[PDB]
């Protein structure tokens, strides 16, 4: 959930995630396709799962 390149952001997408814009999330094992498909403030990672 807000999960990007926390090791070295080189992109806008990567650095956008690092802000954690939303807060903390319960880390649901629900399969999504986008951040809007995941409730609260969770984002869909590159596996299609929230984190």
């Amino acid at each position: 959930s807000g999960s990007g390149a926390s090791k070295a952001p080189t992109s806008f997408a990567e650095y956008w995630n690092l802000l954690s814009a939303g807060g903390v999330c319960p880390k649901i094992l629900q399969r999504c396709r986008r951040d809007s498909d995941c409730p609260g403030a969770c984002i869909c990672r590159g596996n299609g799962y929230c984190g």
Binding site: F12, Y15, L19, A21, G22, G23, S36, G40
Partner: protein, 83 residues
């Protein structure tokens, strides 16, 4: 929930978000999606944001900001919202 500002409402409404109240994620979502689709990021410096001459500058009081300043971004946002 949070309470946005009446200036910011005009920007939000331009992304489809015409509501007076939104969620914490939504506030930054409509903002991010706007800049992402507007092309207001530097190619070489995708971590720098131009707020000068946009509705973000009017409310921030600064000509530009760094996304790297997460602790500053949060204070700017919390000054826009009601906790």
């Amino acid at each position: 929930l949070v309470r946005p500002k009446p200036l910011l409402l005009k920007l939000l409404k331009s992304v489809g978000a015409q509501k007076d109240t939104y969620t914490m994620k939504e506030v930054l979502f409509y903002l991010g999606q706007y800049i992402m689709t507007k092309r207001l990021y530097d190619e070489k410096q995708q971590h720098i944001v131009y707020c000068s001459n946009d509705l973000l500058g009017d409310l921030f009081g600064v000509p530009s900001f760094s996304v790297k300043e997460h602790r500053k971004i949060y204070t700017m946002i919390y000054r826009n919202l009601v906790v």
